Amino acid sequence: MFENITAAPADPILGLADLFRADERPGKINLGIGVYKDETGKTPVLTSVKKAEQYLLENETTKNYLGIDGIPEFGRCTQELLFGKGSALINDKRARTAQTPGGTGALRVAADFLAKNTSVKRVWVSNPSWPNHKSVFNSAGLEVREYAYYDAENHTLDFDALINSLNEAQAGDVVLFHGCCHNPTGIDPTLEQWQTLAQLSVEKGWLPLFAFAYQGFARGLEEDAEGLRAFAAMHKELIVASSYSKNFGLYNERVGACTLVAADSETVDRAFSQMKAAIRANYSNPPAHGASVVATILSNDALRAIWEQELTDMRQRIQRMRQLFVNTLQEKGANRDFSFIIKQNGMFSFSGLTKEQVLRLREEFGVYAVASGRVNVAGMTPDNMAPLCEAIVAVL
Amino acid sequence: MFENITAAPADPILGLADLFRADERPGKINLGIGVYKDETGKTPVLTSVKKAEQYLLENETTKNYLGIDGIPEFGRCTQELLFGKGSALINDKRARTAQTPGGTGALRVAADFLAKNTSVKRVWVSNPSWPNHKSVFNSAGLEVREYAYYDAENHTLDFDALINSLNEAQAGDVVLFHGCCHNPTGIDPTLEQWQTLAQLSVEKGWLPLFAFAYQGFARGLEEDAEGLRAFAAMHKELIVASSYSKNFGLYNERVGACTLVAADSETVDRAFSQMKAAIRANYSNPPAHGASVVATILSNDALRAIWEQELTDMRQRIQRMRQLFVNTLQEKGANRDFSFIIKQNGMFSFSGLTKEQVLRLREEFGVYAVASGRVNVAGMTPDNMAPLCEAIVAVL
Ligand SMILES: Cc1c(O)c(CN)c(COP(=O)(O)O)c[n+]1C
Ligand SMILES: Cc1c(O)c(CN)c(COP(=O)(O)O)c[n+]1C
């Protein structure tokens, strides 16, 4: 019976969204979005994926079920993207990929797989992290500890406080790393940090879990995988949960992958069978469409060139807006160094605004940002950059 | 670390499939399939859904995320299909639907919702049932008890043994009913049985969970919902997990719904928020494509008429094959009453073959059936009906 079921709390971004769409004043700016937007303020479906969908509409003959792990070409392509085209990981066939419902679905089936097939009980998540990670790991029954990350002062990666809290993590604990475009701070380890982290991870026996949602948004496709690759070269095991939601603009088709690396193929196959069991008891087998679109873009040279170009344009649009944000702020006139905004990667960064300030922003100007001061740079267009900077100036 | 991870067992149908596709003799028949096939032996994508996909390819402008519960028109249409177009359930707005990854995904999020938000610990599943139900409920942490169902003698619904084991079920236990086309026996309660079951369910305080995977395959769309409707009229609460995988032939697009009925809207909304939380921590929000195809077929009269006709042809093809199976058996010549095959609904029935017999069938003739003697009637075509009957005759 359900009469004393407690309502679910407000989830941050979600609530803000309809609070936004209640504001009678169309001068309003929703910087709390979380999805990419172009200079029009729209989230278009990529030309390459439109081409790949006319193609599938022309060529699918059955909608019969995929295998639990999804379409194989999709798996193989996510492994080259992740590990690099000649990776020993791929040649020794130490990695296995399950196509999953989104990068979140990949984290939930890594979560269940691990919860029921191993000794891990703790997952270390950065402070702060994308908030839904916690919920996923706890629904699985694992507990989430947090490690320090952000220097809420220098606006950088507090590497010391990070290895310092990581030292409470024991062997066989999972430490989640964001592979590139750290949500929420857009602050990422440099390759030298990633490498000493790879080294301290094998030292302390950490099980790395890479949450890789924005490959291609920080510097480029390979560059962004350079951290995971520094880890993978040194680890016998690691798990990576990737998403194609932002970077192929396929948010609602739920396209992502959970990759298992194990020491050798014999072990990766035996753990993967239990990862398949976990998927079976969850949604049985994955959605073919968005993944079918990713596998035919990535395996066609014409189409993958057009996609790449569409992704580097996304990536460059966000890089012009971090710069144009810093300039229109340092010209609508206040004192700050917002220069840290230029250093950070991907769509998000903490502007360093207080809740009293972001609330002010929202009531007095109609600029909507998450209570953490996390601003999504892609909701900025050259047209709204000056009302937005004005507003931020006026509340500083 | 994963080196002593135990491999996952063989799942029945799955294993049989590639054992099938290893048989060098193309006279072979796979009756273990589980998906619909036409007279060609193929699982086509429906004309209506092809039309609905050219339409979506023409009209989608964004692949931005759906809400946790999916596309609303889809929810509204599954509720009319389930509860009937003028249901008080819908008018009083006591029902809430979450679009989910398949009917299995609906069972897993009913499972988690219930496991973490209520007092239920036991779920009663028929003996036998579709085997993945157990796994879903256990991954959620609920335990599965079984109630008797099939009379492995008279080839019917042993109604007595059914209410007799159901009496060990306590109040607040979930009893899962298959709404129509009982997998695996194709044996369904008659409306009089459904009604005394509705009555004994409210008597003992059972929480009904309808697994509704084959609406439209037994007699017709409304007829098939008549059991659920006998229950819904009498229950303050019930959950129904439906799938559009067979009946729209959208297996791999993972299209299904989890509907919550509660006493009133205030309560249904508050339990639904926690069902949304469960989805959030699982795959965040559902795949739009297959559901977007179901919502535009169902809301367009031209397209929904073509779909209906395509579903009644599926349904009639399976009904010709149950009859043609019984005749070609009662003419390839052995003694039995296979007449119970005609009484049963949907794609499956237990032929009443022994494991020693289905194994024989498989080694000596290359007819592949599940070890339970469950035969999928849709894998029978008028062309393979006589090798198949011959084989079954020769092993009786
Ligand atoms: C790290 C991570 C983040 O941060 C997000 C979004 N903030 C997602 C979302 O992926 P999706 O494919 O939409 O489920 C996944 N992952 C794995
Ligand atoms: C009762 C039930 C059965 O029996 C099956 C298949 N045997 C399914 C499969 O639905 P899907 O939409 O493919 O996950 C669901 N349900 C809810």
PDB file of C-alpha atoms in Angstrom, chain B residues 100-190:
ATOM      1  CA  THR B 100      10.561   2.382 -19.431  1.00  0.00           C
ATOM      2  CA  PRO B 101      13.119   0.279 -21.338  1.00  0.00           C
ATOM      3  CA  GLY B 102      10.882  -2.609 -22.224  1.00  0.00           C
ATOM      4  CA  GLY B 103       8.388  -4.504 -20.190  1.00  0.00           C
ATOM      5  CA  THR B 104      11.429  -6.016 -18.282  1.00  0.00           C
ATOM      6  CA  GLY B 105      12.618  -2.529 -17.414  1.00  0.00           C
ATOM      7  CA  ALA B 106       9.110  -1.797 -16.125  1.00  0.00           C
ATOM      8  CA  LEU B 107       9.251  -4.919 -13.875  1.00  0.00           C
ATOM      9  CA  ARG B 108      12.745  -3.853 -12.571  1.00  0.00           C
ATOM     10  CA  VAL B 109      11.609  -0.324 -11.721  1.00  0.00           C
ATOM     11  CA  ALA B 110       8.329  -1.679 -10.138  1.00  0.00           C
ATOM     12  CA  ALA B 111      10.699  -4.046  -8.257  1.00  0.00           C
ATOM     13  CA  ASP B 112      13.018  -1.308  -6.992  1.00  0.00           C
ATOM     14  CA  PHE B 113      10.241   1.075  -6.297  1.00  0.00           C
ATOM     15  CA  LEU B 114       8.482  -1.470  -4.169  1.00  0.00           C
ATOM     16  CA  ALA B 115      11.691  -2.750  -2.582  1.00  0.00           C
ATOM     17  CA  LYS B 116      12.740   0.615  -1.297  1.00  0.00           C
ATOM     18  CA  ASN B 117       9.415   2.379  -0.744  1.00  0.00           C
ATOM     19  CA  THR B 118       7.154  -0.232   0.774  1.00  0.00           C
ATOM     20  CA  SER B 119       6.850  -3.096   3.162  1.00  0.00           C
ATOM     21  CA  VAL B 120       6.841  -5.800   0.404  1.00  0.00           C
ATOM     22  CA  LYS B 121       9.300  -8.453   0.590  1.00  0.00           C
ATOM     23  CA  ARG B 122       7.655 -11.407  -1.251  1.00  0.00           C
ATOM     24  CA  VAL B 123       6.451 -11.542  -4.831  1.00  0.00           C
ATOM     25  CA  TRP B 124       4.348 -14.496  -5.891  1.00  0.00           C
ATOM     26  CA  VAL B 125       5.123 -15.657  -9.458  1.00  0.00           C
ATOM     27  CA  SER B 126       3.243 -18.510 -11.187  1.00  0.00           C
ATOM     28  CA  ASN B 127       4.663 -21.899 -11.535  1.00  0.00           C
ATOM     29  CA  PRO B 128       5.829 -21.691 -14.190  1.00  0.00           C
ATOM     30  CA  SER B 129       6.386 -18.110 -15.316  1.00  0.00           C
ATOM     31  CA  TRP B 130       8.700 -16.342 -17.709  1.00  0.00           C
ATOM     32  CA  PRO B 131      12.011 -17.094 -15.842  1.00  0.00           C
ATOM     33  CA  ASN B 132      13.432 -13.590 -16.021  1.00  0.00           C
ATOM     34  CA  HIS B 133      10.730 -12.303 -13.619  1.00  0.00           C
ATOM     35  CA  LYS B 134      12.484 -14.066 -10.672  1.00  0.00           C
ATOM     36  CA  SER B 135      15.830 -12.537 -11.506  1.00  0.00           C
ATOM     37  CA  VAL B 136      14.357  -9.074 -11.669  1.00  0.00           C
ATOM     38  CA  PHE B 137      12.655  -9.295  -8.373  1.00  0.00           C
ATOM     39  CA  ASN B 138      15.650 -10.805  -6.685  1.00  0.00           C
ATOM     40  CA  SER B 139      18.063  -8.189  -8.065  1.00  0.00           C
ATOM     41  CA  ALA B 140      15.725  -5.725  -6.387  1.00  0.00           C
ATOM     42  CA  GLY B 141      16.051  -7.658  -3.130  1.00  0.00           C
ATOM     43  CA  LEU B 142      12.536  -9.086  -3.062  1.00  0.00           C
ATOM     44  CA  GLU B 143      12.011 -12.730  -2.754  1.00  0.00           C
ATOM     45  CA  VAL B 144       9.957 -14.767  -5.027  1.00  0.00           C
ATOM     46  CA  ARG B 145       7.582 -17.414  -3.976  1.00  0.00           C
ATOM     47  CA  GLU B 146       5.666 -19.419  -6.624  1.00  0.00           C
ATOM     48  CA  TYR B 147       2.016 -20.287  -6.783  1.00  0.00           C
ATOM     49  CA  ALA B 148       0.671 -23.232  -8.707  1.00  0.00           C
ATOM     50  CA  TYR B 149      -0.832 -22.654 -12.057  1.00  0.00           C
ATOM     51  CA  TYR B 150      -0.544 -25.335 -14.658  1.00  0.00           C
ATOM     52  CA  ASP B 151      -2.154 -28.695 -14.548  1.00  0.00           C
ATOM     53  CA  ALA B 152       0.626 -30.819 -16.091  1.00  0.00           C
ATOM     54  CA  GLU B 153      -1.880 -33.497 -16.771  1.00  0.00           C
ATOM     55  CA  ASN B 154      -5.107 -31.925 -17.971  1.00  0.00           C
ATOM     56  CA  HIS B 155      -3.205 -29.111 -19.711  1.00  0.00           C
ATOM     57  CA  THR B 156      -5.209 -26.452 -18.096  1.00  0.00           C
ATOM     58  CA  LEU B 157      -5.333 -23.807 -15.374  1.00  0.00           C
ATOM     59  CA  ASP B 158      -5.464 -25.656 -12.095  1.00  0.00           C
ATOM     60  CA  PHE B 159      -7.584 -23.044 -10.489  1.00  0.00           C
ATOM     61  CA  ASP B 160      -7.906 -24.901  -7.185  1.00  0.00           C
ATOM     62  CA  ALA B 161      -4.231 -25.450  -6.702  1.00  0.00           C
ATOM     63  CA  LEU B 162      -3.790 -21.802  -7.665  1.00  0.00           C
ATOM     64  CA  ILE B 163      -6.106 -20.292  -4.997  1.00  0.00           C
ATOM     65  CA  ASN B 164      -4.811 -22.921  -2.609  1.00  0.00           C
ATOM     66  CA  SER B 165      -1.143 -21.838  -2.841  1.00  0.00           C
ATOM     67  CA  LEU B 166      -2.190 -18.204  -3.007  1.00  0.00           C
ATOM     68  CA  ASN B 167      -3.627 -18.589   0.448  1.00  0.00           C
ATOM     69  CA  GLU B 168      -0.062 -18.742   1.933  1.00  0.00           C
ATOM     70  CA  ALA B 169       0.433 -15.300   0.450  1.00  0.00           C
ATOM     71  CA  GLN B 170      -0.048 -12.745   3.184  1.00  0.00           C
ATOM     72  CA  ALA B 171      -1.451  -9.197   2.948  1.00  0.00           C
ATOM     73  CA  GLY B 172       0.911  -6.712   1.335  1.00  0.00           C
ATOM     74  CA  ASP B 173       2.608  -9.443  -0.752  1.00  0.00           C
ATOM     75  CA  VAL B 174       2.753  -8.794  -4.453  1.00  0.00           C
ATOM     76  CA  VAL B 175       1.141 -11.443  -6.634  1.00  0.00           C
ATOM     77  CA  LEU B 176       2.187 -11.137 -10.253  1.00  0.00           C
ATOM     78  CA  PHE B 177      -0.484 -11.991 -12.810  1.00  0.00           C
ATOM     79  CA  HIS B 178       0.173 -12.382 -16.508  1.00  0.00           C
ATOM     80  CA  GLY B 179      -2.611 -10.274 -18.077  1.00  0.00           C
ATOM     81  CA  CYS B 180      -3.084 -12.430 -21.223  1.00  0.00           C
ATOM     82  CA  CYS B 181      -1.019 -15.018 -23.168  1.00  0.00           C
ATOM     83  CA  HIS B 182       0.512 -16.620 -20.048  1.00  0.00           C
ATOM     84  CA  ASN B 183       4.144 -17.235 -20.718  1.00  0.00           C
ATOM     85  CA  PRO B 184       4.967 -20.181 -20.795  1.00  0.00           C
ATOM     86  CA  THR B 185       1.717 -22.099 -20.965  1.00  0.00           C
ATOM     87  CA  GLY B 186      -0.494 -19.784 -22.946  1.00  0.00           C
ATOM     88  CA  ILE B 187      -3.143 -20.726 -20.344  1.00  0.00           C
ATOM     89  CA  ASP B 188      -5.134 -17.761 -19.095  1.00  0.00           C
ATOM     90  CA  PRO B 189      -7.832 -17.294 -16.476  1.00  0.00           C
ATOM     91  CA  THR B 190     -11.244 -16.927 -17.942  1.00  0.00           C
TER      92      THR B 190
END
